[PDB]
Design a protein around this ligand. Structure first.
Ligand SMILES: COc1ccc(S(=O)(=O)N(CC(C)C)C[C@@H](O)[C@H](Cc2ccccc2)n2cc(COC(=O)N[C@@H]3c4ccccc4C[C@H]3O)nn2)cc1
Lengths: 99, 99
């Protein structure tokens, strides 16, 4: 579908058998979720944004369904104040910007 | 035009008679630029992101040209590490998300 930007581009995602809401975010290279229960191993990480840096857990090859589109890829989990879908998954679901 | 997300969606902008590069960013409600010389009055402000909060200067009704599309609107200026175009201007240039 097409989505306009008069409101936040929020979508429903399924990950780890849990349902969540997340922001389609073209300015994020990576996908970052608030703390949640995930299975398997993780690598410790740091990412920066406006405001300063956060330590996150990098999870690889995780399956995620994004407004019904499956994707598999890296998901970082940590103190973000908003669930964010970044370019690493946006490309896999065929998402593009048009103006 | 259409832009895919395998790379950062960076565009050229003109603002205050200066040329800059900026990130098309669907997860930003507002437009935020690194420190720059702007004319006229500004209001003091605070915005939050991943990482913590920043104080910014809110400038209103500023003209900005975004990859050749004019827009007029609020522009926040401050310690952001990347020039960001947010939804308040993305809608004015007719930008949309498609998947
Ligand atoms: C009040 O109006 C606002 C306008 C913008 C923002 S935002 O914080 O800038 N925002 C939303 C966010 C809090 C989820 C937009 C978001 O796309 C930003 C863009 C950004 C990126 C880098 C610096 C400042 C702004 N965003 C992106 C990410 C996650 O980013 C990454 O995937 N990692 C890269 C990375 C990793 C280490 C160091 C620097 C960077 C730059 C990144 O592109 N978090 N927020 C908040 C309020």
């Amino acid at each position: 579908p097409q989505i306009t930007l008069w409101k936040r581009p929020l979508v429903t995602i399924k990950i780890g058998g849990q349902l969540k809401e997340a922001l389609l975010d073209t300015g994020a290279d990576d996908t970052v979720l608030e703390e949640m229960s995930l299975p398997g191993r993780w690598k410790p990480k740091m990412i920066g944004g406006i405001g300063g840096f956060i330590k996150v857990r990098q999870y690889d090859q995780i399956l995620i369904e994004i407004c019904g589109h499956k994707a598999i890829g890296t998901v970082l989990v940590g103190p973000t104040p908003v669930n964010i879908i970044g370019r690493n998954l946006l490309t896999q679901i065929g998402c593009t910007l048009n103006f």
